[PDB]
Design a protein around this ligand. Structure first.
Ligand SMILES: CC(=O)N[C@H]1[C@H]([C@H](O)[C@H](O)CO)O[C@@](OC[C@H]2O[C@@H](O[C@H]3[C@H](O)[C@@H](O)[C@H](O)O[C@@H]3CO)[C@H](O)[C@@H](O)[C@H]2O)(C(=O)O)C[C@@H]1O
Ligand SMILES: CC(=O)N[C@H]1[C@H]([C@H](O)[C@H](O)CO)O[C@@](O)(C(=O)O)C[C@@H]1O
Ligand SMILES: CC(=O)N[C@H]1[C@H]([C@H](O)[C@H](O)CO)O[C@@](O)(C(=O)O)C[C@@H]1O
Lengths: 243, 266, 260, 260, 255
């Protein structure tokens, strides 16, 4: 018939200690391209989960409702953030952000692209193998499945528009020092996942795949150090049985 | 609050109007609509915000006329919310640049209200259901607030323990709580957060705009126990005092909700 | 009144409504007095010429009757735009240079663009930044304000019944009234907000409600109201003045039958 | 004046194309498409802008295939875009470095993008920042302006009947006239406003009014008007000049029967 | 003379950006920008000038003739998340802060047609002396700073036509569809969307797509994302590759 699955997917911003869940390690700056060795806890990664479905005929994903969870937490301007001026409140989270989700019946297919092909990525990350200068533009060698939570750095990977026949994905990147976060919540908004032929993602092995990245911006500490802040994403997916 | 019978009968329409005041903190009797001045740079390990500094969600339960003559029959009637017209009241008050605000430069006018803002409303037949999320799980929240109980590091992302009903006016801090998209089957909610030091407030008014509250099946919120719930948060931005201190500024929200009678089984 | 059918077998009225920014001298029409800053809430006594006010005009219409069914003028559509937006491309006159050897500073900052069309004067609700503000002679402002006047105080009800008298900072259109008026406004606040203004003669606003009924000129009068604060002009001295522009209205009306 | 049916058949449809060059002031033989460097901080009582500092409206009359005297050419659609937007990616020539060792400063700041298509010259209304501005020989500006010229003065009516003569800062399209023209403009003011310009050959603006009637070409003439001030160019010295670009028009016309 | 639709093929392509590539390690970047060259002595180096990207995709030789007709395109910019690397090379925003994001003037442009993209030349400075290896407006005058109808070119060579010299020509391109947005300014934030759910229809008002004249499909792009600011304060253009997926069908025509 029809079934609904829901999930809250936690962000994977780096979590530099047991208290700073949802933040990255402070950002380094001005590393030469030839000596760029980022620490694991400084690198936000894609979130993903496989949701098992009742077995029989295949589950077909028809609609998704999704939103970013805890957007009002950024109205805490009393904790940790640099004052905007003498006697002023804390600096809001602002700057470069990326909001991305995907729903599919297979893992999200990703293409690798690097700012700096010579970056030395740390143990525990999965990044483009044997990168060249061409890895800074399009290098068709860099193909991956988003098949591990907290492993694929957001800065290394994008959804692959040449694949993903069985996934729908949506993402917006906004770059800049002072970019304001703009986030909407409503339980009245639905994305239809049906393609031009009226067919949604088909859950291959009774598995539904949800993927996210919600880098909200940079938190500026009193010291001037900066950390990424991320938030969880909710998914509610309606499925129907197809032959 | 005005509950008006626009039409009687089977095709009965009722319109409920109300002005929900903001709950920005009100640090003294003269600064209604404003918070206490903001502190800054508290370590996560010693973050003890004062009550009057924390904007809270506004909410009211509006009782409706009882529809069920005899409680012992196959079909009962319930009020169904079909549309809402809503706007923020007093947006032009921010054109007062002569009172209290820091000059933008030598010989200049006062600094406009600007910076992080949040505009939110909900209409439902049950209390708004909220999920807790914290900037800093170690924040020590003051007496008179209701905040996530026994928070952990997971409370900075998603901790499913932090479930609450917006069941008290001027108590749930906006920074601790969001509407819960996993619940609220019987509420419609809408909110926009815009963060940043210099974000301009952008506010529209018109008596020509209506939000339809009907779901995919053409059913609006159904008023359980003859109760309509309105909720709001309208943090317009930060007011900068001549000293350089900053206070949140909030404004009241108007609601006009059109309801009709729906028959349901017992 | 009970509304019947549209009479078949249309007229258009137009008006240019001047802004009321304060007009501090005979040469500065369209500007306010220089803005004061940092007045304590307890001693805030703004000068009349510093306070932009709502603009309004009544357009008289011919009565349609002689004697069960009467005729009334019904407003169906309005075309409206702000007049003189290109005047802000004058960066040579009076404005502070943006830097050494540069052109003048554009008008920018907080702006408010508002219009209403109705068959009754616009109904307004009072809200104050500072309830203790002492408003000057010649203004009409909320009577006996309290701290609650900084949020919603239902005592503060007015008719926009005088041109150049109701300060924009004290009054908003009242969404709890205005049964017989349509209003539209946008406030954009901030030091450096860029003005964004569109002109086109191809845009029409429909004034018909859900039942297909426009404002009814019950007393053979049509009411137009405006506020168009474009932003702040920064003088070479560093002083700032509000700048306002006129608004054009073209309203299409038809005859509507109503029950006596 | 009375509009009847669209006439079809062979040669009942025509398309005209044209490029309108911008008229930014052209301060010397090499600086076509730029203004003279901007002055700043002139007192309102002593504001004497040089001709070459004042961008003006562009306009042209396009003759159409002669029809006799009744059929008229009716403008149905226009495709239009600004030409040469990528020229602003030259940050090596003339522009002030953004900081030590940086590239040149992009063109940015106040901009105005405007076009009109009609069967009569564009009708304009005059509005001035400063009524006391002394406009130079070779410009056509509001005649005998008063303080009221800073808001709405109904005396200031003109036809856009001369290319490179009507300063953009003095004139706007008149919404009270232009029955037989369709115009569209956006003003964006501010020091740091980014230019945002779109190109595509797939986008069409429909010129038909509510009754399905386009501009009707009196005397087999089509009128195109433009102003495309893209922003300010900042020289290494800090001096600023307006930069303008040409506008392309492709207009589709059909034959319409009317009566006299 | 276009007759009935007669079946379907799909071509896909990744078009690399041509930002200047100042050395073998800085593929996708330009040479550092010069500033404040007088209009009378403006001699930009080749590797400082982003150029239009283009490729001709040969299609099966179908020959009343049949021609391949382009019906839809799906396109997006590839690698937008690479700009979240604020640890490599970029100037700190302040003491102890992270690197400065890529920002400033950007241009995002694509075209699909059955002929080479037709371009019109327009120059900031007609006196610019363009370097060997570029194709720029021939015999420019002051009118070349506004509209000079002499400056007509085909985008017929990859990495040769500087973006700053050329725009798509709206007076031609009968057999091409093009789309571009320019956003100018020092601190403009890049805003880029990805989704595999967006399709652009290439059919004109008569329901006819670009017709592949000599069994050739033409894709063109420019995706200048903004300026990268080095620790030193020097700036370089950053560009990204563009993906195309084009659906074609067979169309009967007279001849
Ligand atoms: C892009 C550009 O040309 N920039 C120059 C700029 C402009 O020419 C003017 O501002 C336009 O009004 O002029 C700057 O120098 C100002 C002097 O210009 C002299 O003209 C020169 C011009 O500068 C040279 O580029 C050109 O080769 O020769 C012209 C004639 O000798 C005027 O004669 C003089 O009165 C000044 O106004 C400036 O900084 O504004 C120089 C810019 O490089
Ligand atoms: C009346 C008003 O609007 N602002 C006043 C504030 C607020 O009352 C408090 O900040 C509330 O916490 O207090 C001051 O001491 C300050 O912070 O500079 C003086 C200032 O005039
Ligand atoms: C990303 C990168 O490695 N950039 C380097 C650049 C570029 O190689 C050139 O600017 C190309 O023209 O050169 C520098 O000397 C500089 O400009 O400060 C050092 C800098 O680290």
């Amino acid at each position: 018939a029809i079934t609904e699955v829901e999930c809250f997917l936690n962000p994977e911003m780096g979590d530099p200690d047991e208290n700073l869940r949802g933040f990255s390690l402070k950002l380094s700056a001005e590393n030469d391209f030839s000596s760029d060795s980022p620490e694991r806890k400084m690198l936000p990664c894609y979130s993903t989960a496989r949701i098992p479905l009742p077995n029989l005929l295949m589950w077909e994903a028809v609609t998704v409702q999704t939103e970013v969870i805890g957007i009002t937490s950024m109205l805490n301007l009393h904790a940790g953030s640099q004052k905007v001026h003498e006697h002023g409140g804390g600096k809001p989270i602002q700057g470069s952000n990326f909001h991305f989700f995907a729903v599919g019946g297979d893992p999200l297919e990703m293409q690798g692209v690097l700012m700096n092909y010579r970056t030395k990525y740390p143990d525990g990350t999965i990044t483009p193998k044997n990168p060249t200068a061409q890895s800074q533009v399009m290098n068709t060698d860099h193909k991956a499945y988003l098949d591990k939570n907290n492993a694929y750095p957001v800065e290394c990977w994008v959804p692959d528009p040449s694949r993903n026949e069985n996934t729908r994905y949506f993402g917006t990147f906004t770059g800049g020092e002072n970019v304001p976060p703009v986030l909407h919540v409503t339980n009245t908004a639905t994305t239809v996942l049906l393609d031009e032929q009226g067919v949604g993602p088909l859950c291959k092995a009774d598995s539904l795949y949800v993927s996210a990245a919600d880098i909200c911006g940079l938190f500026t500490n009193s010291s001037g150090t900066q950390q990424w802040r991320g938030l969880a994403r909710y998914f509610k997916i309606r499925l129907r049985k197809r032959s």
